[PDB]
Write an enzyme that holds these catalytic residues in place. Sequence first.
Site, PDB file in Angstrom:
ATOM      1  N   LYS A 109       1.602  -5.220   4.442  1.00  0.00           N
ATOM      2  CA  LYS A 109       0.429  -5.794   5.071  1.00  0.00           C
ATOM      3  C   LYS A 109       0.402  -7.313   4.548  1.00  0.00           C
ATOM      4  O   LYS A 109       0.690  -7.675   3.936  1.00  0.00           O
ATOM      5  CB  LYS A 109      -1.089  -5.596   5.169  1.00  0.00           C
ATOM      6  CG  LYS A 109      -1.081  -3.442   5.053  1.00  0.00           C
ATOM      7  CD  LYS A 109      -0.773  -3.756   7.301  1.00  0.00           C
ATOM      8  CE  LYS A 109      -1.681  -4.743   7.425  1.00  0.00           C
ATOM      9  NZ  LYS A 109      -2.975  -4.368   7.270  1.00  0.00           N
TER      10      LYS A 109
ATOM     11  N   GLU B 102       5.992   9.028   1.400  1.00  0.00           N
ATOM     12  CA  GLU B 102       6.876   9.053   2.708  1.00  0.00           C
ATOM     13  C   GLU B 102       7.839   7.728   2.288  1.00  0.00           C
ATOM     14  O   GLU B 102       8.599   7.071   2.609  1.00  0.00           O
ATOM     15  CB  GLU B 102       6.368   9.109   3.639  1.00  0.00           C
ATOM     16  CG  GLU B 102       5.928  10.225   3.643  1.00  0.00           C
ATOM     17  CD  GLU B 102       7.344  11.481   4.214  1.00  0.00           C
ATOM     18  OE1 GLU B 102       8.450  10.404   4.722  1.00  0.00           O
ATOM     19  OE2 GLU B 102       6.991  12.879   3.703  1.00  0.00           O
TER      20      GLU B 102
ATOM     21  N   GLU C  78      -6.553   7.827   7.446  1.00  0.00           N
ATOM     22  CA  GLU C  78      -5.774   8.670   6.900  1.00  0.00           C
ATOM     23  C   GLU C  78      -6.777   9.599   6.504  1.00  0.00           C
ATOM     24  O   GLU C  78      -7.701   9.321   5.664  1.00  0.00           O
ATOM     25  CB  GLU C  78      -4.438   8.169   6.612  1.00  0.00           C
ATOM     26  CG  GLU C  78      -3.873   6.595   6.994  1.00  0.00           C
ATOM     27  CD  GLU C  78      -3.421   7.026   8.598  1.00  0.00           C
ATOM     28  OE1 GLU C  78      -3.263   7.606   9.284  1.00  0.00           O
ATOM     29  OE2 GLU C  78      -3.564   5.603   8.682  1.00  0.00           O
TER      30      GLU C  78
ATOM     31  N   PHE D  21      -9.032   1.717   4.611  1.00  0.00           N
ATOM     32  CA  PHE D  21      -8.017   0.746   4.227  1.00  0.00           C
ATOM     33  C   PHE D  21      -7.726  -0.235   5.640  1.00  0.00           C
ATOM     34  O   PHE D  21      -7.946  -1.436   5.444  1.00  0.00           O
ATOM     35  CB  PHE D  21      -6.637   1.271   4.661  1.00  0.00           C
ATOM     36  CG  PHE D  21      -6.098   0.851   5.425  1.00  0.00           C
ATOM     37  CD1 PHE D  21      -6.402   2.732   6.282  1.00  0.00           C
ATOM     38  CD2 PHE D  21      -5.640   0.569   6.027  1.00  0.00           C
ATOM     39  CE1 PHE D  21      -6.172   2.272   8.104  1.00  0.00           C
ATOM     40  CE2 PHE D  21      -4.517   0.761   7.256  1.00  0.00           C
ATOM     41  CZ  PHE D  21      -5.510   1.659   8.017  1.00  0.00           C
TER      42      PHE D  21
ATOM     43  N   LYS E  23       1.157  17.637   4.992  1.00  0.00           N
ATOM     44  CA  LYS E  23       1.204  18.204   6.181  1.00  0.00           C
ATOM     45  C   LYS E  23       2.456  19.752   6.088  1.00  0.00           C
ATOM     46  O   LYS E  23       2.495  20.539   5.759  1.00  0.00           O
ATOM     47  CB  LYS E  23       1.969  17.614   7.340  1.00  0.00           C
ATOM     48  CG  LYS E  23       0.988  16.436   7.616  1.00  0.00           C
ATOM     49  CD  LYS E  23       0.979  15.285   8.892  1.00  0.00           C
ATOM     50  CE  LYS E  23       0.111  14.288   9.027  1.00  0.00           C
ATOM     51  NZ  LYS E  23       0.514  14.036   9.728  1.00  0.00           N
TER      52      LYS E  23
ATOM     53  N   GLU F 188       0.819  -1.088   0.220  1.00  0.00           N
ATOM     54  CA  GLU F 188      -0.313  -0.026   0.159  1.00  0.00           C
ATOM     55  C   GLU F 188       0.996   1.417  -0.145  1.00  0.00           C
ATOM     56  O   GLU F 188       1.846   0.889   0.619  1.00  0.00           O
ATOM     57  CB  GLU F 188      -1.153  -0.127   1.668  1.00  0.00           C
ATOM     58  CG  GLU F 188      -1.895  -0.823   1.405  1.00  0.00           C
ATOM     59  CD  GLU F 188      -1.348  -2.042   2.587  1.00  0.00           C
ATOM     60  OE1 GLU F 188      -0.023  -2.040   2.651  1.00  0.00           O
ATOM     61  OE2 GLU F 188      -1.765  -3.465   2.190  1.00  0.00           O
ATOM     62  N   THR F 189       0.329   2.006  -0.465  1.00  0.00           N
ATOM     63  CA  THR F 189       0.879   3.984  -0.635  1.00  0.00           C
ATOM     64  C   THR F 189      -0.075   4.073   0.674  1.00  0.00           C
ATOM     65  O   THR F 189      -0.677   4.833   1.231  1.00  0.00           O
ATOM     66  CB  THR F 189       0.816   4.219  -1.865  1.00  0.00           C
ATOM     67  OG1 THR F 189      -0.278   4.148  -1.751  1.00  0.00           O
ATOM     68  CG2 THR F 189       1.265   3.555  -2.987  1.00  0.00           C
ATOM     69  N   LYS F 190       1.748   4.815   1.563  1.00  0.00           N
ATOM     70  CA  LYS F 190       2.172   5.652   2.730  1.00  0.00           C
ATOM     71  C   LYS F 190       1.236   6.535   2.662  1.00  0.00           C
ATOM     72  O   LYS F 190       1.408   7.381   1.377  1.00  0.00           O
ATOM     73  CB  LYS F 190       3.033   5.639   3.561  1.00  0.00           C
ATOM     74  CG  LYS F 190       2.800   6.204   4.695  1.00  0.00           C
ATOM     75  CD  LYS F 190       3.852   5.606   5.465  1.00  0.00           C
ATOM     76  CE  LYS F 190       3.812   5.858   7.392  1.00  0.00           C
ATOM     77  NZ  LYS F 190       2.432   6.641   7.205  1.00  0.00           N
ATOM     78  N   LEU F 191       0.715   7.198   3.113  1.00  0.00           N
ATOM     79  CA  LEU F 191      -0.285   8.603   3.321  1.00  0.00           C
ATOM     80  C   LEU F 191       0.330   9.208   4.370  1.00  0.00           C
ATOM     81  O   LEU F 191       0.301   8.803   5.349  1.00  0.00           O
ATOM     82  CB  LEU F 191      -1.836   8.492   2.766  1.00  0.00           C
ATOM     83  CG  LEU F 191      -1.908   8.298   1.464  1.00  0.00           C
ATOM     84  CD1 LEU F 191      -1.527  10.106   0.114  1.00  0.00           C
ATOM     85  CD2 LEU F 191      -1.919   7.483   0.660  1.00  0.00           C
TER      86      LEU F 191
END
EC number: 6.5.1.1
Lengths: 51, 26, 422
Positions: free
Chosen positions: C401, C396, C316, C336, C330, C256-259
């Site tokens: 998972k 990032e 998120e 998810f 940020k 998964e692409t971290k947000l």
Amino acid sequence: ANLFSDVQFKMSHKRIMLFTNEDNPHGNDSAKASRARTKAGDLRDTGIFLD
Amino acid sequence: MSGWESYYKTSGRDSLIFLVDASKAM
Amino acid sequence: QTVASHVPFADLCSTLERIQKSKGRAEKIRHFREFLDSWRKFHDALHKNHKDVTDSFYPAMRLILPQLERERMAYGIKETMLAKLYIELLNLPRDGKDALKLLNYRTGDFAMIAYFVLKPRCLQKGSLTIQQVNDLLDSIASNNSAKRKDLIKKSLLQLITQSSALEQKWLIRMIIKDLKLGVSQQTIFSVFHNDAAELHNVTTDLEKVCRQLHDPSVGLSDISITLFSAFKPMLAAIADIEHIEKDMKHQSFYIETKLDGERMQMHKDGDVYKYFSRNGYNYTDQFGASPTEGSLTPFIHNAFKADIQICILDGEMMAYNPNTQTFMQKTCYCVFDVLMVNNKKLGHETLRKRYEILSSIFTPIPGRIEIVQKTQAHTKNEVIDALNEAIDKREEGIMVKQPLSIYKPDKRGEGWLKIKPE
């Protein structure tokens, strides 16, 4: 024995009298007879006369 | 209802040791 | 109508004696499991009509584990005091053999000596249930804290006269708080429920461990997540790519692409929208509480399908610019994970079932709410490619998972893995 212990005064003599006409109070059960024998022996050691 | 009584429903290797007398007669 | 009022203490004493006599752990576990299963079946039979029941296995569990007793204060009767009380109550001679054996026990534990002394001097079948024994012990403790010994003597006399030799031995062991059976606390807790030890560690109160974890099927996940309640979402653990294949036994996984968005949870129930943060802070005012108020809530009411009425989600929160169709680091939300849908609870189900059911919650719509992009990978090359793509996209890092992983709130590790360049 519990009744004897409650008394606060000094007791020179401890005595119990058994008014009964059954020479075999426990003939069907032997554990009860053994418990009675043990309790009687303990009372005799304590200093309680039995008649 | 019933009660609590119903639910409870209460090869190897041989070994040899020699023992020899050590008396005068022997 | 507590179950403990129908269970003779003699049965528990016999079960403990059988556990102690057995040598192998298998027999001890079997005896404990059989006793617990009988108790559970009787509890189910008794409480068929009642809705709210506080009855549990606590009355017997407290006795089986005296070292975990905190509701009852110190009894104030140690080995010597117990021996003195036994000598006085039984009216044994002061200089007799029994008195010398009881007093001179080399301060072959005292319980065995007491059992031998009382074996030819006590009954063969008691009549005291677990509830009565617990009440007598409570009275003894309360009177000890109140500095009164006459009633303590009375209670001990009642216990002595209404108990057998084995029951007296077990009661003495419980009072001394030295109940040894060959099975430690961990084994007993594991036999009781699969998630008892960690819960007891979390909270040092035995009653809740026995109450909440009553049904073996209902795991800790179901009770840890409740409607209109703020729980603690878990987090991933940083791991190196070089050994990533070793983190999951070389099994297939999800990338998964971290947000870069704040972790937050929400609950939808009809026209009610509750919101919470990772720390429990409430921010329902930011997005409103009804579809007619707020900025994000009005645009997601129609997203949910008619088949979904009550649901709980976590994800998120970030910020989205439609003009450039970009996500600024940020209002947009990514989904998810689902914690509960309808009456059934999805906490027990593995991540695979959660992923399968996510698609049926609502129709994705870019701009307001959708499902975070993710794929399935099983090779290190795929992980490297995903990391490179994320870096090219300014993300990032990567989320790894394990489908077999289960939801374990308030724990670090498991299939939640964080991959970042280093």
